[PDB]
Design an enzyme around this catalytic site. Structure first.
Site, PDB file in Angstrom:
ATOM      1  N   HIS A   1      -5.609  -0.108   1.464  1.00 26.37           N
ATOM      2  CA  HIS A   1      -5.835  -1.454   1.806  1.00 26.37           C
ATOM      3  C   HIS A   1      -7.143  -1.330   2.819  1.00 26.37           C
ATOM      4  O   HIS A   1      -7.729  -2.471   3.230  1.00 26.37           O
ATOM      5  CB  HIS A   1      -4.670  -2.019   2.514  1.00 26.37           C
ATOM      6  CG  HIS A   1      -4.353  -1.801   3.922  1.00 26.37           C
ATOM      7  ND1 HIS A   1      -3.541  -0.417   3.989  1.00 26.37           N
ATOM      8  CD2 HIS A   1      -4.505  -1.994   4.993  1.00 26.37           C
ATOM      9  CE1 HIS A   1      -3.368  -0.505   5.295  1.00 26.37           C
ATOM     10  NE2 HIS A   1      -3.996  -1.356   6.145  1.00 26.37           N
TER      11      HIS A   1
ATOM     12  N   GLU B   1     -11.552  -2.961  15.243  1.00 23.66           N
ATOM     13  CA  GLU B   1     -10.388  -3.466  16.101  1.00 23.66           C
ATOM     14  C   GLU B   1     -10.264  -2.589  17.329  1.00 23.66           C
ATOM     15  O   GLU B   1      -9.415  -3.129  18.282  1.00 23.66           O
ATOM     16  CB  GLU B   1      -9.196  -3.463  15.331  1.00 23.66           C
ATOM     17  CG  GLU B   1      -9.347  -4.728  14.182  1.00 23.66           C
ATOM     18  CD  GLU B   1      -8.098  -4.845  13.351  1.00 23.66           C
ATOM     19  OE1 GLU B   1      -7.939  -5.881  12.712  1.00 23.66           O
ATOM     20  OE2 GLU B   1      -7.067  -4.393  13.726  1.00 23.66           O
TER      21      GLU B   1
ATOM     22  N   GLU C   1      -0.086   3.322  13.631  1.00 22.40           N
ATOM     23  CA  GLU C   1      -0.663   2.927  12.416  1.00 22.40           C
ATOM     24  C   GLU C   1      -1.966   2.116  13.190  1.00 22.40           C
ATOM     25  O   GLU C   1      -2.066   0.895  13.056  1.00 22.40           O
ATOM     26  CB  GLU C   1      -0.133   2.177  11.432  1.00 22.40           C
ATOM     27  CG  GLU C   1      -0.993   1.787  10.109  1.00 22.40           C
ATOM     28  CD  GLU C   1       0.009   0.903   9.434  1.00 22.40           C
ATOM     29  OE1 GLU C   1       1.179   0.672   9.581  1.00 22.40           O
ATOM     30  OE2 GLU C   1      -0.776   0.558   8.249  1.00 22.40           O
TER      31      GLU C   1
ATOM     32  N   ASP D   1       0.759  -1.207   0.165  1.00 20.38           N
ATOM     33  CA  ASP D   1      -0.019  -0.148  -0.021  1.00 20.38           C
ATOM     34  C   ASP D   1       0.990   1.197  -0.075  1.00 20.38           C
ATOM     35  O   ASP D   1       1.511   1.584   1.001  1.00 20.38           O
ATOM     36  CB  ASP D   1      -1.140   0.053   1.206  1.00 20.38           C
ATOM     37  CG  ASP D   1      -1.778   1.068   1.240  1.00 20.38           C
ATOM     38  OD1 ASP D   1      -1.611   2.223   0.458  1.00 20.38           O
ATOM     39  OD2 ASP D   1      -2.984   0.802   1.852  1.00 20.38           O
TER      40      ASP D   1
HETATM   41  C1  LIG Z   1      -7.348  -3.176   8.264  1.00 20.69           C
HETATM   42  O1  LIG Z   1      -6.170  -2.747   8.987  1.00 20.69           O
HETATM   43  C2  LIG Z   1      -5.898  -3.164  10.279  1.00 20.69           C
HETATM   44  N1  LIG Z   1      -4.861  -4.163  10.717  1.00 20.69           N
HETATM   45  C3  LIG Z   1      -3.830  -3.620  10.706  1.00 20.69           C
HETATM   46  C4  LIG Z   1      -2.740  -4.213  11.109  1.00 20.69           C
HETATM   47  C5  LIG Z   1      -1.152  -3.490  11.058  1.00 20.69           C
HETATM   48  N2  LIG Z   1      -0.587  -3.386  12.600  1.00 20.69           N
HETATM   49  C6  LIG Z   1       0.919  -3.063  12.405  1.00 20.69           C
HETATM   50  C7  LIG Z   1       1.183  -1.726  11.957  1.00 20.69           C
HETATM   51  C8  LIG Z   1       2.729  -1.394  11.944  1.00 20.69           C
HETATM   52  N3  LIG Z   1       2.695   0.151  12.040  1.00 20.69           N
HETATM   53  C9  LIG Z   1       3.630  -2.169  10.806  1.00 20.69           C
HETATM   54  O2  LIG Z   1       4.301  -1.419  10.127  1.00 20.69           O
HETATM   55  O3  LIG Z   1       3.335  -3.161  10.787  1.00 20.69           O
HETATM   56  C10 LIG Z   1      -1.468  -2.518  13.496  1.00 20.69           C
HETATM   57  C11 LIG Z   1      -1.962  -3.168  14.512  1.00 20.69           C
HETATM   58  C12 LIG Z   1      -1.078  -3.990  15.316  1.00 20.69           C
HETATM   59  O4  LIG Z   1      -0.847  -3.396  16.497  1.00 20.69           O
HETATM   60  C13 LIG Z   1      -0.951  -4.464  17.506  1.00 20.69           C
HETATM   61  N4  LIG Z   1      -1.373  -3.776  18.764  1.00 20.69           N
HETATM   62  C14 LIG Z   1      -2.936  -3.754  18.837  1.00 20.69           C
HETATM   63  N5  LIG Z   1      -3.433  -3.097  19.996  1.00 20.69           N
HETATM   64  C15 LIG Z   1      -2.155  -3.373  20.753  1.00 20.69           C
HETATM   65  C16 LIG Z   1      -1.666  -2.908  21.965  1.00 20.69           C
HETATM   66  N6  LIG Z   1      -2.635  -2.409  23.008  1.00 20.69           N
HETATM   67  N7  LIG Z   1      -0.501  -3.037  22.598  1.00 20.69           N
HETATM   68  C17 LIG Z   1       0.446  -3.128  21.330  1.00 20.69           C
HETATM   69  N8  LIG Z   1       0.257  -3.671  20.155  1.00 20.69           N
HETATM   70  C18 LIG Z   1      -0.964  -3.528  19.883  1.00 20.69           C
HETATM   71  C19 LIG Z   1      -1.790  -5.827  16.898  1.00 20.69           C
HETATM   72  O5  LIG Z   1      -0.830  -6.755  17.105  1.00 20.69           O
HETATM   73  C20 LIG Z   1      -1.158  -5.450  15.374  1.00 20.69           C
HETATM   74  O6  LIG Z   1       0.082  -6.313  15.001  1.00 20.69           O
HETATM   75  C21 LIG Z   1      -2.755  -5.714  11.593  1.00 20.69           C
HETATM   76  N9  LIG Z   1      -1.894  -6.348  12.131  1.00 20.69           N
HETATM   77  N10 LIG Z   1      -3.889  -6.143  11.068  1.00 20.69           N
HETATM   78  C22 LIG Z   1      -5.116  -5.321  10.741  1.00 20.69           C
HETATM   79  O7  LIG Z   1      -6.150  -5.954  10.375  1.00 20.69           O
END
Ligand SMILES: COCn1cc(C[N@@H+](CC[C@H](N)C(=O)O)CC[C@H]2O[C@@H](n3cnc4c(N)ncnc43)[C@H](O)[C@@H]2O)c(N)nc1=O
Ligand SMILES: COCn1cc(C[N@@H+](CC[C@H](N)C(=O)O)CC[C@H]2O[C@@H](n3cnc4c(N)ncnc43)[C@H](O)[C@@H]2O)c(N)nc1=O
Lengths: 319, 319
Positions: free
Chosen positions: A262, A112, A103, A11
């Site tokens: 995306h 989410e 992000e 993306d």
């Molecule tokens: C439709 O887009 C939604 N989308 C997005 C992502 C992308 N992800 C990585 C972005 C990162 N800039 C990169 O470059 O990889 C973001 C969410 C990530 O943040 C994590 N997370 C969530 N709560 C947390 C908490 N409280 N503490 C710590 N970590 C936490 C979660 O584990 C995930 O990995 C995903 N992976 N799936 C999805 O569907």
């Protein structure tokens, strides 16, 4: 699993907007400390280090944190980018930070429910007056005549002209199946599907007091618009943009009028298409809410009034 | 639900092959009786009536049988096309039939295990010497260098050149995730992905004695081929064709060298890519089997030997 990370790195709108949004804030990041909430495979934490940050804490709750650590090592940054597994709500950093990057946006912005973790980290770890990247989000709605949906439903009534068999009865069946549910549908549209000027129905300054409570109660607002032309109204699309502070701010948009991302858009289909014409008035209200069982599943409450029809309500939940 | 029926009617290869395969047999169908096993929304039963059948029994176990009945009515055929709900194994027809037509093929030909129901109906309801449409199926395998997979895996090692961040470690992770599982992947390829001449490894005359038992024990055979050029070998693709008797038979093919269909191909990925060169010998054996818990879920047992490497085995099950 890896499909989503593939879709993110492929993306270019998302990746280049974060890259330049971070680089644009070099003055605020240079020699400073950053927390990357949900660092995933780590690219945003590397961007911050490359923008001059002295130390970056990359916190990631999923299993993919191990890949971030290897990314950091491959880029020679193990001395100033530290990958920390687990939720940011209980991570231990050695210091408060000058900035947070994240992000956190989901489909329909809030599917989410991750924005709450960024807000928790802001309250807990961000120095007073510190920076959040992106700093704000705006939500938009437009009525849509989804050309692909129009084709898919109408094709049953075209079978006679392609195969010599009348199947027009399948149009109604397909309409019930594809529109007569209460799921939010994630699909990409284009400008051809937009049936009136998009309306901004909410703006979220991410640092604002009370936002955590506003997310639980519902984020949204009313809208009004006037249709561009005669078409079947299929419902509404919801999308967002986020803004990185600057001096002209960089906006990452998920509008169907802008390059695809995306995130696509979140589509809210009425139970059946409603014919409209040029200048048909449409008004309504959109509220994004947590689902009662699970605040991480997005719920959207739609109220809408089309022309002279009575106001209707439809309560959607993420597919 | 309706997505699959949409994909079928929008599949011009599938629809026109059945239409013309039926019309080609007008001489055998005119004034005769037909059983359509798994008639779905009914189009094949209408085709048979339009080819002159005097009576058609359209048997459909899923809920969509009601739409077939309405299709029949819309085409003015309620007097000679009779829609009967439920499994063909227990339907009651008033007479044995002169022909059976059925669209029984699944992904990888046999996923869903429906051919057994057609065979049960043949034994129970088909007159002696009666017609089956299609009459035969052939299975093909080719080694593949999946260009899209090559791009998706290799892009992680291209991030440095697009965003200034080395992420090459994600290539190995992605390889483990995308190739180091034992699921059959359904994806469409093109001729660009085919790494040696496709090999026919089995032929099924659908009327042949013992086929029911052969499906339980496994359908397949050995293959050998020689690679076209230097490329990463990712595994093998399996596809099929079916033939409608005539006087030159009409073939419906799902080969990646032919127009795309909704069946795509069934891809069997090795745990990691294997470099090959022009004339690298590849041999092996492919067996399609029922899964032990559930004969309707396709299992594929692959044995393969690449060049001088030792023979390996990989046991796949449908995604
Ligand atoms: C439709 O887009 C939604 N989308 C997005 C992502 C992308 N992800 C990585 C972005 C990162 N800039 C990169 O470059 O990889 C973001 C969410 C990530 O943040 C994590 N997370 C969530 N709560 C947390 C908490 N409280 N503490 C710590 N970590 C936490 C979660 O584990 C995930 O990995 C995903 N992976 N799936 C999805 O569907
Ligand atoms: C990847 O392609 C696989 N594929 C295909 C179909 C298409 N379907 C309709 C085709 C019909 N020419 C039409 O024009 O609609 C075929 C299977 C249909 O046959 C039914 N069926 C199965 N066992 C039965 C039994 N023993 N007796 C009676 N009916 C039985 C089953 O209910 C289904 O409707 C599907 N629907 N889904 C899938 O995934």
């Amino acid at each position: 699993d890896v499909s989503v990370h593939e879709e993110m790195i492929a993306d270019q709108v998302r990746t280049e907007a974060y890259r330049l949004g971070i680089l644009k804030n070099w003055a605020a990041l240079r020699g400073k400390t950053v927390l990357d909430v949900g660092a995933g495979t780590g690219i945003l934490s590397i961007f911050c280090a490359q923008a001059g940050a002295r130390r970056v804490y990359a916190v990631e709750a999923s299993a993919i944190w191990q890949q971030a650590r290897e990314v950091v090592r491959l880029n020679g940054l193990e001395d100033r980018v530290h990958v920390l597994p687990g939720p940011v709500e209980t991570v231990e950093l050695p210091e408060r930070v000058d900035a947070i990057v994240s992000e956190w946006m989901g489909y329909g912005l809030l599917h989410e429910s991750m924005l709450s973790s960024v807000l928790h980290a802001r309250t807990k770890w961000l120095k007073e007056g510190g920076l959040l990247l992106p700093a704000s989000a705006e939500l938009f709605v437009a009525p849509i005549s989804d050309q692909m949906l129009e084709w898919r439903l109408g094709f049953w009534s075209q079978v006679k002209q392609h195969y010599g068999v009348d199947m027009s009865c399948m149009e109604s069946f397909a309409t019930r199946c594809l529109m007569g549910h209460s799921e939010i549908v994630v699909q990409d549209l284009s400008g051809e599907d937009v049936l009136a000027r998009p309306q901004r129905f909410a703006q979220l300054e991410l640092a604002r007091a009370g936002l955590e409570q506003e997310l639980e109660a519902g984020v949204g607002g009313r809208f009004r618009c006037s249709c561009y032309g005669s078409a079947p109204l299929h419902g509404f699309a919801v999308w967002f943009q986020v803004t990185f502070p600057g001096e002209k701010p960089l906006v990452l948009s998920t509008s169907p009028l802008h390059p695809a991302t995306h995130w696509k858009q979140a589509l809210l289909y009425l139970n059946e298409p409603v014919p409209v014409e040029q200048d048909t008035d449409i008004s309504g209200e959109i509220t994004l809410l947590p689902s009662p069982d699970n605040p991480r599943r997005l719920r959207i409450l739609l109220r809408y009034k089309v022309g002279d029809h009575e106001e209707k309500t439809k309560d959607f939940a993420m597919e």
